[PDB]
Amino acid sequence: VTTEQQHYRDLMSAFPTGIAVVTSLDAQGVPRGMTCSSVTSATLSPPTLLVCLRNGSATLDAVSATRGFAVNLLHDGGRHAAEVFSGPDPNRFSRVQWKQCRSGLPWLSKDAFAVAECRVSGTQEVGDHTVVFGEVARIAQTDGTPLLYGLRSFAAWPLP
Amino acid sequence: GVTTEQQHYRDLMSAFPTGIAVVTSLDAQGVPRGMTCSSVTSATLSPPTLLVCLRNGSATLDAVSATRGFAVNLLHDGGRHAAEVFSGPDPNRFSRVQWKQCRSGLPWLSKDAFAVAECRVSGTQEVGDHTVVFGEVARIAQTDGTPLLYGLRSFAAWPL
Ligand SMILES: Cc1cc2nc3c(=O)[nH]c(=O)nc-3n(C[C@H](O)[C@H](O)[C@H](O)COP(=O)(O)OP(=O)(O)OC[C@H]3O[C@@H](n4cnc5c(N)ncnc54)[C@H](O)[C@@H]3O)c2cc1C
Ligand SMILES: Cc1cc2nc3c(=O)[nH]c(=O)nc-3n(C[C@H](O)[C@H](O)[C@H](O)COP(=O)(O)OP(=O)(O)OC[C@H]3O[C@@H](n4cnc5c(N)ncnc54)[C@H](O)[C@@H]3O)c2cc1C
Ligand SMILES: NC(=O)C1=CN([C@@H]2O[C@H](COP(=O)(O)OP(=O)(O)OC[C@H]3O[C@@H](n4cnc5c(N)ncnc54)[C@H](O)[C@@H]3O)[C@@H](O)[C@H]2O)C=CC1
Ligand SMILES: NC(=O)C1=CN([C@@H]2O[C@H](COP(=O)(O)OP(=O)(O)OC[C@H]3O[C@@H](n4cnc5c(N)ncnc54)[C@H](O)[C@@H]3O)[C@@H](O)[C@H]2O)C=CC1
């Protein structure tokens, strides 16, 4: 017995999350990234998160080529960035402010309140996606109200 | 206990808010087990598969591994007490919430959850002291409700 895809979409839509832009570099050195809601903590020993990226995506290809990626947590002013990095716009990085970290990884310096640089420590394919484990290597974090996505809409963390 | 490094990582991940589920199963002797879970993540639509990340040695992970199935109970904004009890030290948590047994046997938190998804374990991946559990969704029931949220070390309600 297996549920239908629409019922599953409706279920998962009702689990709201923060919003990241996951970034890396492709083999040509070109920044790549996507809006990502699948950031999940895996373990503290060593500090490891995971993301789940669509197979064939430019971002997964860059993550695999660089074996590292940055997780840029968006604050409430970052809705436009989240739209850019989930939509059909070309040259997404020309539409946001960004800087290259010491690692070379793209950091969204205006739209994110925190950025974690991760080394790819393993992957696991599941259907048409790949779970990517990231061992966190460097963190820069400031105060900010997190952007949220849930029930097919953007919102803001409701507490000061 | 945590190291300084691990604390910086907790500070980061705390700023990625999520909905809140209670993941339930039965142990080998039929006893209901469950825990508060913020690691619910969508993996793929083909077939519909989510994942959760459960601590190794937890009663819930042992039950999930025994029975190869589990329920994901998404809590609505009246469910804070259930989330607190299912994240605390008391093994008699099931006597402190109102619940019902699904036809399959899985525990359903009927008073505190607005949705329940019954899952078959389709794979696992150990990562440090945790196990990522892949759940192929077999059945979903859902009603309207405002999702409970957790972020920045606080409960809140979805604001829209
Ligand atoms: C709130 C939210 C959360 C999301 N979370 C996740 C998640 O956790 N995991 C995940 O895998 N995806 C997620 N997505 C979807 C993801 O952000 C988009 O699919 C994104 O476009 C992928 O970017 P990419 O460059 O890696 O992929 P590609 O599909 O390889 O796109 C490459 C480039 O082509 C352009 N492009 C974008 N979309 C299209 C299109 N439809 N047709 C043609 N060209 C296009 C853009 O310039 C893009 O950079 C999420 C989307 C939203 C809105
Ligand atoms: C907001 C929030 C989100 C969380 N998200 C996650 C998550 O995504 N993943 C995760 O792994 N944890 C998560 N936790 C932690 C998790 O909810 C707690 O660790 C929870 O108490 C685990 O329950 P358990 O019964 O499976 O674990 P256990 O630690 O096995 O048991 C809890 C208590 O019951 C006792 N006990 C266990 N089994 C038995 C038995 N057979 N007989 C007698 N006593 C027994 C234990 O000694 C302990 O005192 C989260 C906590 C919070 C607050
Ligand atoms: N690839 C992914 O993991 C995700 C992709 N998206 C995509 O973003 C767009 C908008 O999403 P919503 O506004 O939430 O409406 P929606 O109704 O399409 O999706 C609801 C929820 O279902 C899950 N989901 C949807 N498509 C998925 C996919 N292809 N793979 C895995 N899980 C998926 C996610 O939890 C998503 O938030 C859609 O194109 C959706 O596919 C959104 C979230 C996760
Ligand atoms: N085991 C898990 O995956 C999780 C466990 N918890 C438990 O609840 C407690 C309180 O959490 P918060 O109030 O958010 O404050 P916190 O500062 O203790 O934790 C902040 C965040 O760090 C991550 N994290 C913490 N402990 C973790 C662990 N053992 N494994 C993986 N990721 C972990 C989670 O994303 C958590 O929300 C944590 O200290 C922990 O015991 C909470 C979230 C997930």
DSSP code string of chain B = ---HHHHHHHHHHHTS-EE-EEEEEE-TTS-EEEEEE---EEEEETTEEEEEEEETT-HHHHHHHHHSEEEEEEEBTT-HHHHHHTTSS-TTGGGSS--EE-TTS-EE-TTTEEEEEEEEEEEEEEETTEEEEEEEEEEEEE---PBEEEETTEEEE---
CB contact under 8 A, B127 and A144: no
Secondary structure element (H or E) that encloses residue A33, with its range? strand A31-36
Residue nearest to atom 19 of ligand 3 (CA): A9
CB contact under 8 A, A8 and B125: no
Domains of chain A (ranges plus CATH)? Answer: 5-152 (2.30.110.10)
CB burial class (10 A; 0-12, 13-18, 19+) of residue B132? buried
Cα of A9 vs centre of ligand 3, distance in Å, is 7
Cα of A19 vs centre of ligand 3, distance in Å, is 13
d(CA A155, CA A160): 14
Cβ–Cβ contact A6 with B under 8 A: no
B90 is in an annotated binding site: yes
Among chain A residues, CA nearest to B132: A42
Cα of B49 vs centre of ligand 4, distance in Å, is 23
Backbone CA torsion sign across A26, A31, A37, A42: positive
Cβ–Cβ contact B147 with A under 8 A: yes
Which residues on neighbouring strands pair with residue A120, listed in sequence order? A134
Q: Is the minimum distance from the CB of B58 to ligand 4 under 6 angstroms?
A: no
Q: Which of B43, B136, B154 sits opposite A52 (nearest CB)?
A: B43
CB contact under 8 A, A45 and B129: yes
Cβ atoms of residues A61 and A120 within 8 Å: no
Question: At what resolution in Å was this solved?
Answer: 1.4
Q: Is A64 helix (H, G, I), strand (E, B) or coil?
A: helix
Type of residue at B126: E
Q: Is the minimum distance from the CB of A43 to ligand 4 under 6 angstroms?
A: yes
Type of residue at B2: V
CB contact under 8 A, A150 and B11: no
Burial A77-114 (b: 16+ CB within 10 A, else e): ebbebbebbbeeeeebbeebebeebebebbbbeebbbb
User: Which 25-84 residues of chain B touch chain A by CB within 8 A?
Assistant: 39-51, 53, 74
- 3-state DSSP helix/strand/coil % of chain A, to nearest 5: 20, 50, 35
d(CA A61, CA A57): 6
Interface with chain B: mutation pick from A44, A49, A117, highest number of B CBs within 10 Å: A44
Nearest chain B Cα distance for residue A47, angstroms: 6
Dmax (CA) for chain B in angstroms is 47
Type of residue at B41: T
> Which tokens go with B7?
């604390």
Please state, in angstroms and as integers, the Cα–Cα distance from residue B7 to each residue in A68, A98, A106, A133, B21, following that order: 22, 27, 24, 19, 24
> Which tokens go with B113?
């959850």
B39 is in an annotated binding site: yes
Nearest chain B Cα distance for residue A67, angstroms: 18
Q: Is A81 helix (H, G, I), strand (E, B) or coil?
A: helix
Cβ–Cβ contact B121 with A under 8 A: no
DSSP states along B100-112: EE-TTS-EE-TTT
Taking Cα atoms as reference points, which of A159, A160, A156 lies closest to residue A75?
A156
Q: Is the minimum distance from the CB of B131 to ligand 4 under 6 angstroms?
A: no
